[model samples]
Target: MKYLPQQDPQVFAAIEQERKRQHAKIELIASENFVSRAVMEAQGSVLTNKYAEGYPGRRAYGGCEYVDIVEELARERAKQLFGAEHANVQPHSGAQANMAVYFTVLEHGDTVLGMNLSHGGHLTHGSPVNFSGVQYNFVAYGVDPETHVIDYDDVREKARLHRPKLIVAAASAYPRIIDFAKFREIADEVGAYLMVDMAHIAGLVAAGLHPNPVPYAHFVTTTTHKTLRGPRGGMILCQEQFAKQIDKAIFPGIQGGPLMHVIAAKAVAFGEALQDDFKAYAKRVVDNAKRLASALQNEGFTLVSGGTDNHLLLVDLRPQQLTGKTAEKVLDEVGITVNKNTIPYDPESPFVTSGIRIGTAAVTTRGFGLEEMDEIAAIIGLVLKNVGSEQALEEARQRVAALTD
Candidate 1:
């Protein structure tokens, strides 16, 4: 940081401002979390100086011996953490991890069954603008309109109808526990490969707070940072039978050199997740989310699924006669950070979503408990309740400062 400030004061100022903002706000973004100091130091280590182009002990570049150790630690830790037969610690991001899996298994125009984007599915699952939908034939399955939960019957119907080569059991915003066994049954019935992108819930899965997809899916992918609290990178876990193919696809097909520093950070994070305290922290995350959801409901807000079973809650603001876009801005003014998202069967455009996605992962990491969550929910309710009143917004801001302080 000393050299960084001297070399580029402009960038250093921006970084400091961001640090201050994070400290001053209550972060509720479902996809975001705070990483450990150990993980941070590892990501900023000298491992970044190396270029490890391939797997351990078989790199295409020289001077990779030390980097190989870091990568191996990352892979081994990930495998043990997820109980997977094989692990690939090299994909740069979650999207690339999914791309590597697709490269390994699917041909151009291969049929795939995936969750619908507006129904909590990620863009990589089958969004038409993404490479997946552009290259492969995707059939989308959505949630039940009434319950706002994944419709297994519809999934089975689509699986039998399309007989997709891949059946993706994943979600970016879904809050309930996924039925991996049911998804596996559908995949088996249709002879499709099951892949679960547990990116959002990886930490909960690791902590045994959520169902583990590793044992059921043929392949599973996740980002290191979200709830796992690592560097911003991705990893893949699969059965041993697909190990070579997954490795080759990641190395020569989709990505080039791996980020060894991030891998080191991931190893550090995995080591942290394996500890006893992490399990307690994960339980607190879920507890805080439930507390927040109950507070919001008591404040007369509607949750998309009626409630949450994990770290995030999707609030359908339509019940409050508010738009997600406006709610996000209002909450930000009160020092609460959250993202506007589309709910199941949202009638609004993606740009102007109908819901806001809130989570307790980051705040829980900051040591916020159920009481803090209740207060935060009150802040949100106050801000949104008086969205057009500057006086009320200012009062809410003061309350936010009090909590953050």
Candidate 2:
């Protein structure tokens, strides 16, 4: 909002209106979450003024003593959060973390295999236009076309042929659990280093809902803001032996001065994640998503992978005979916010995607449970059925409001 005063008045106004709408509606985007008020306070602190150019106590700049303490707390908590031997809380985003990790382990032009972007994979996972693919010889493996699930056999087959220098596995919109051990085995067989980007499911992994990747992946990276509910930042975790190289890549190779304020917010987030109730919150996130998925399916919506095991599920739009863009517009009118998503082997273009990806993290953050998820799903079904009808949308919005009651 601060940057809004500087440029794009119309877009800024639209963004302001959207913020107001968010305060009054339901948010279902899987990759978005509500950070605690304390996290916000820390993020806006005075530490933002500091320019910490290196690790704590080893800064390239002189005025980093206070910033050093803040950075170290964040690093320590992150290490404990994921049970890693070392952690770097300096990468600005998950993409930066991945870039730094690749820099640490492999030469430019080294062969790498990752999940395909359209099929529940992220941009850095070997999308042709991205840096990961541009700088390296990148190959992709996708989910099984039939089950819409990760086919480890396919991964193994690709590894056997490509013999990549690195194997990266992660997702932006994937629904099922990823087998870190299997990914490790594939990397091992191919004589490649394995990196896991558990950005979306960090909270779930912390809570023991999904299996932890720390013990398996040689390197792990994640964004702090998704299910982890921190400020917008990223972290890199690796074994103790790779500490110096990993830290150097993050600082001298990739980023400049660190954001001490955001690091402080991350420390607050990690502290919250350490609490017992945080695990319960994480479990409820999964539970609510499952309930929402089941309800949507019962309403005859076609869900990718039949159903979901994590915090998100993709709803294919071919049955509704509507495009994702059309659905997003109509749903926005009804106070339900969700994003258009690409299904595995999507037939439509990204702009006119044939699927909508929904999640329960935001609603779960708002303290909604199974009953609320079911009601929200029912309203969504109605909206999908009568996307162009004002009457249907209003009725659904009324019921959606009732759920909060």
Candidate 3:
């Protein structure tokens, strides 16, 4: 970084400022995490200079021998970590990973059953604006209205009615254990291909803190960055029978040259995840999330689903007369970052939803534990409860500064 100033002063300064901001804020976003120094080193390695457009031993261009080492290590480590027969360390992001799976199986206009976006599903899980919805026929299943949990009965009913060629079992915002076995049962009953997007829970899955979807789903896809604490990239793990088709789908079907540098980083991150320390970290992530959920509830906040079984909490702000948009702004003012999200059966619009989503993955990575989570809940209560009170906002900001400092 010191040399970076002489090379590109403006860009170096911007990067440094972000580095400072990350250190200065309590990041609660569910989908973000800080990578290890080893992972960062691999991502910025010399391997980025290569152009390996195909799988190992089979290349469309020269100078791929060294890059093959990086990719093969990544694929092998990923397979071992998840106990899968095959792994594709390519797709640029989780969305692309889903795209590859879709391309591999369904023809355009085939019926697909997925979770509803507003009810804790990913955009790629059949949002009308996304490719999955536009190119395929998609039917959505949502959570129970009162319990705010996945309604297995509803999913089965939808599957029976739609008879989709594929069934997606995953969520981006839900805060409970996903019953992959039950999902598989329904998919099998309907003769549909089951794909589990374990993007949010990849780390927990790796650590054995959550149910592994690998054994049940025909295909499992995830972003390596999220709980996995890797560089920003996506991966696919599948049965050996689907290995060749999945690999071909990711390569010539969608992407060209893989990001060898990111693949190297993914391998490093997978190596780290296989360690005991990462398992402990994952345990603490869930512990912190539970502590925070309980603390927020004590402060009169209503949590969707009552609480969480994982690393995130979906907080309904209507009881506090606060919009998710307003709460996000207020919390940001005090250096605690969170995102506004729609709760099941949300009455508000997406942009001004009635809830906020917070997670413990990033804060737990920074060594925050039970006490810090309690204090964070106190800060959130102060800011959201004070709304227009500048005096309270400033005092809460001081508390945040003390915590980060």
Candidate 4:
């Protein structure tokens, strides 16, 4: 704030306003979280000036000695946190991390299986518009329509039919604990490599609340932010055997220079995760999500899968006779931020779906507990159930301001 204000007044002012906005709003977005002060400081440090092209000691550039230590810390911490043999902290984002894994394993037009995009999968998994589906022949497996859970039989059927070279596990909006063992079993039967995109539940996995995919998959990809509470970046964890090919794919194949500062911030976040407090924080995040889910159901809102087993839940607004877009707007007007999402076997299009995704990671990070979660659900109910009433919205806004304060 000191030097930036003098250097660029406009950008500085915008950043200041954003800071205020984050403090004011109730962040319910499943993919977002507030980083610690240490993480912010590490990310804004002078390490951004470095251009270490390669991993740890064998940097392509000169004067990377200190930056080498930073990257090494990030890599080691990630490995320790995830129980993986090798760690790569250089991918720019979760999508990049996933792409590098594909680059290392599959060829163009190779058959691969991933979760259905409408059934809680990420766009990078197999959305037709994404590079994954554009190049590779990415087929999909889906959840049960009624139960809203992954049908292992369907996955096995798809694998047997397609004979895919790779089978992806994990999802972005899924609420239950993924059965990595089942996915690996299917992969082994078809002689396919297993990759897991744990971007959304990385922190839960790291904290041992969720199953660790490293033991069951060939490669595990995750974003450093989200419930991990770090700066924006991605990391990959794989067995030591695939280390060389993965590194090559990331460097000579896809990217050039890694972001040194963000990697250092990842190190800080990893250090924090190693502490006992992060475990409790992660537990609270799940507990809060479950409480919020129950509260929402009590308000006559049907949740996807009946409830959540992790840190996020999807509210099927169809029962309330509302589109995801409409609920998202009204909640935003009341200072509660959420994203419209597609539910399993959604009747509506992706842009205007039947559900909204909500999570407790950010709110839990700011110290909101089960009681606060109850209030939040009530506020959402008031806003959504009385959308056209400005009186209801004003009251919700006042309640939101009180909670943040």
Against the true structure, whose lDDT is highest?
A: 4
lDDT of 4 by residue, 261-307 (tens): 99999999999999999999999999999999999988888999999
Off by over 4 Å in 4: none
- Evaluated against the true structure, the overall lDDT of model 3 is 0.93
Model 2: residues with Cα > 4 Å off, grouped in runs = 1-19
Weakest 10 consecutive residues of candidate 3 by summed lDDT: 1-10
List model 1 lDDT by residue over 87-125, tens digit each. Answer: 999989999999999999999999999999999999999
Q: What TM-score, over all chains together, does every model reach?
A: 0.99, 0.94, 0.99, 0.99
TM-score of 1: 0.99
lDDT by residue (tens digit), candidate 3, 1-405: 467899998999899899999999989999989999999989878888888888988989987888888888998889889999999999999999999999999999999999989999999988788898899998999999888999999999999999999999999999999999999999999999999999999999999989999999999999999998999989999999999999999989999988999999999999999899999999999999999999999888999999999999999988888889999988888888999999899899999999999999999999999999989999888888888999999999999988888
Q: Per-model C-alpha lDDT, please? A: 0.92, 0.89, 0.93, 0.94
Record all residue pairs in model 1 with backbone atoms less than 3 Å apart, i.e. clashing: none
Model 1: lDDT of residue 269: 96
Order of the predicted models by lDDT, top scorer first: 4, 3, 1, 2
> The CA-based lDDT of model 2 is what?
0.89
The model with the greater lDDT, 1 or 2, is 1
Q: For residues 355-385, write the lDDT of model 2, one tens digit per residue.
A: 9999888889889999888888889889989
Query: In model 2, how large is the Cα lDDT of residue 381?
Result: 89
Off by over 4 Å in 1: none
